[PDB]
Amino acid sequence: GRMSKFTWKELIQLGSPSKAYESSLACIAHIDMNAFFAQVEQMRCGLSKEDPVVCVQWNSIIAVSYAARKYGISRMDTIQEALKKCSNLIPIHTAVFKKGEDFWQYHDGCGSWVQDPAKQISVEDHKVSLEPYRRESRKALKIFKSACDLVERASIDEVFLDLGRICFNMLMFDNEYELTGDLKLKDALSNIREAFIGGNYDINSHLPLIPEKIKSLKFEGDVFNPEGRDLITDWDDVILALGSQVCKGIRDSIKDILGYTTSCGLSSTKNVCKLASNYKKPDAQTIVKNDCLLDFLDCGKFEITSFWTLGGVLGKELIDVLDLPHENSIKHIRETWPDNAGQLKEFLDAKVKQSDYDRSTSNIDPLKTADLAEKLFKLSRGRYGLPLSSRPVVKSMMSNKNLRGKSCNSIVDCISWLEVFCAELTSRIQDLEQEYNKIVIPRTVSISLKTKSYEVYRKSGPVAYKGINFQSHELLKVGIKFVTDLDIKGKNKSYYPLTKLSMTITNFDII
DNA sequence: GTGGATGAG
DNA sequence: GGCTCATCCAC
Ligand SMILES: Nc1ccn([C@H]2C[C@H](O)[C@@H](COP(=O)(O)OP(=O)(O)OP(=O)(O)O)O2)c(=O)n1
Ligand SMILES: [Ca+2]
Ligand SMILES: [Ca+2]
């Protein structure tokens, strides 16, 4: 007591873009668009957020609006099943490419669920286009980057934000913000601000106890506080409070510009944010204070298999290995080794040197069992902070069509599909340049397919650009040759009807 | 050198 | 259940 637990070094780190995630006062955020595809189709057709709309692909549902979820409809239910749950369901099929044409289109009012035999989208000669979701995604991304100086795109509809710089500056220099009436952050946070500019402190000194007045700062969103704890006790709570405020603005910016609802999760770690953002949906914001991490991790909805990269076999193994139960496993891993990663480390090292398994059907890499320990240790305590890295440069881009029926039955048929794959790849190449803001062009194409008997043929080679680097024509030119050379390689062999056909581009010159 | 595994969208 | 993405490694 009589002094804040944290130090200046830790608070200042929020200003550094490369060392802000390690800080204890770190304020990360994860934002996941609710029923994305379902939402975008809703917005496109000018429907309301409460409409039972659903994104359809062929016969399956790939996106379920929360409005339609009240009818018990779930992802991947066949349209037929859904309609038996909500006869007033509003199914919308994704845009599609028609064999031969170089552009995708929306066939609203058409679908397998439609009686009229004319209005149909035969999967036989159609390719799903995900471009619409791409664009919208790209938009939300530009708004995110304009509000935060560090955004990690985890997926097509997910992003992580490092509110470090914002919270810090807001904490030390914002003079507009109001907490209540006749009270501003500047006057409520005088000591700390006046001690900061003074700079008569040592980076390793401890921060002054938060001012009794700052406790009137309110959190924006749901603060996961089951054990009914004090919302504001130290700076991490202040930083988190401001963070939640700032965060609300950004999200609203999205609902206002694009009209997409979202769920968000704040905490001092990417992993906890990931869980928090999923805790409540739709259009919510779960806030996990550091002093509520365990209460949260032990609420009863998570498991070791509920964390990141552990929801698969690697997860089901760690259970049968560490001899973990099937309930309150996170609280377990924590209590069986409440000293340090070393405890659990030597436990694995000892559990791997016996007649329990072989180094073949296992997912653990013994020479790295030291990390696995430190990881699980931290994860079980909600302190495994990963840096908000950036998505690595793209290596390749494929565009295929798992052929069904006698669609691709000849060479021209192959070509017709090639036209589609190029139109799409070309489209995706532009989207790439927009992200890297640098010219991107494939230096090599590749054609592969699967014969009637499922055999694999494939020709790879370099694509040459001469004139205006038309990465939307010469690409197809090479594709045709290749698909034609393969047509010759299998003349009196099992070949047509092809069962699969795909075009891929690699070796990119990010000049 | 890749078809599968693995994990999540 | 359909289909897109990004490692990583025995055979
Ligand atoms: N097996 C899956 C999982 C997801 N998606 C698509 C549907 C969504 O538009 C986008 C989003 O991924 P989510 O898993 O986050 O799906 P939702 O947006 O539908 O629901 P929620 O926001 O509750 O996660 O990816 C898909 O085609 N196939
Ligand atoms: Ca998700
Ligand atoms: Ca989502």
- Map out the domains of chain A as residue ranges: 1-33+131-301, 34-130, 302-380, 395-511
Residues 6+ positions from A212 with CB-CB distance below 8 Å: none
CA distance A286 to A299: 14
Query: What's domain A1-33+131-301's superfamily in CATH?
Result: Reverse transcriptase/Diguanylate cyclase domain (3.30.70.270)
Method: X-ray
Tokens 């664009």 found at: A135
Residues linked to residue A398 through DSSP beta bridges, in sequence order: A504
Residues linked to residue A446 through DSSP beta bridges, in sequence order: A460, A504
Backbone angles phi, psi at A82, to 5 degrees: -55, -50
Ligand 1 pocket: which of A54, A56, A62 to mutate (most atoms within 8 A of CB): A62
Cβ-based burial of A109 (10 A; exposed 0-12, middle 13-18, buried ≥19): exposed
Backbone angles phi, psi at A504, to 5 degrees: -135, 150
Q: Is A507 left (phi over 0), alpha (psi -120 to 50) or beta?
A: left
Residue whose CA lies closest to nucleotide B6 C1'? A312
Q: Enumerate residues lining ligand 1, CB below 6 A.
A: A 32-37, 62-63, 156-157, 281
Backbone angles phi, psi at A9, to 5 degrees: -50, -45
A192, two tokens: 């700390």
CA distance A401 to A450: 11
Q: Would you give the DSSP letter of residue A184?
A: B
Q: For residue A158, how far is its CA from the centre of ligand 2 (angstroms)?
A: 7
In our burial notation (b when 16+ CB lie closer than 10 A, e otherwise), range A431-440 reads ebeeeeeeeb
CA separation (Å) from A452 to A418, A492, A502? 19, 13, 15
ω into A325 cis (within 30 of 0)? no
Residues linked to residue A28 through DSSP beta bridges, in sequence order: A162, A267
- Strands A285-287, A222-223: pairing is parallel
CA distance A8 to A24: 11
Sign of torsion, CA A219 A220 A224 A225? Answer: positive
Distance, CA of A327 to C1' of C1, in Å: 30
Strand C positions with any atom < 7 Å from protein CB?
1-7, 9-11
ω into A282 cis (within 30 of 0)? yes
Q: What is the DSSP string of A70-138?
A: GGT--TT-BHHHHHTT-TT-EEEEPPEEETT-SSEE--TT-STT-S-SSS---GGGEEE--HHHHHHHH
A283, two tokens: 């259009």
Distance, CA of A459 to C1' of B1, in Å: 14
Residues 6+ positions from A197 with CB-CB distance below 8 Å: none
In our burial notation (b when 16+ CB lie closer than 10 A, e otherwise), range A378-402 reads ebbebebbeebeeeeebeebebebe
Q: Does domain A34-130 have CATH number 3.90.76.10?
A: no
Contact call for residues A463 and A504 (beta carbons, < 8 A): no
A453 touches strand B (CB under 7 A): no
Q: What is the number of other CB atoms lying within 10 angstroms of the CB of residue A463?
A: 19
Residues 6+ positions from A286 with CB-CB distance below 8 Å: A221, A222, A224, A263, A264, A265, A266, A276, A277, A279, A280
Q: In what order do the strands lie in the sheet with A158-162?
A: A151-155, A158-162, A28-33, A262-267, A285-287, A222-223
Contact call for residues A349 and A306 (beta carbons, < 8 A): no
Backbone angles phi, psi at A12, to 5 degrees: -65, -35
Intrachain domains A302-380 and A395-511 with the same fold: no
Minimal-distance CA residue to ligand 1 atom 22: A34
CATH topology of domain A302-380: DNA polymerase; domain 1 (1.10.150)
CA separation (Å) from A271 to A202, A251, A378? 32, 20, 11
The beta-carbon contacts of A410-417 under 8 Å, at least 24 apart in sequence, are A410/A496, A411/A483, A411/A484, A411/A487, A413/A99, A413/A498, A414/A449, A414/A483, A414/A487, A414/A498, A414/A501, A415/A480, A415/A483, A416/A99, A416/A100, A417/A99, A417/A127, A417/A501
Cβ-based burial of A301 (10 A; exposed 0-12, middle 13-18, buried ≥19): exposed
Contact call for residues A62 and A69 (beta carbons, < 8 A): no
Q: Does domain A395-511 have CATH number 3.40.718.10?
A: no
Q: Is A157 annotated as a binding residue?
A: yes
CA distance A183 to A185: 7
Backbone angles phi, psi at A377, to 5 degrees: -55, -60
Contact call for residues A504 and A418 (beta carbons, < 8 A): no
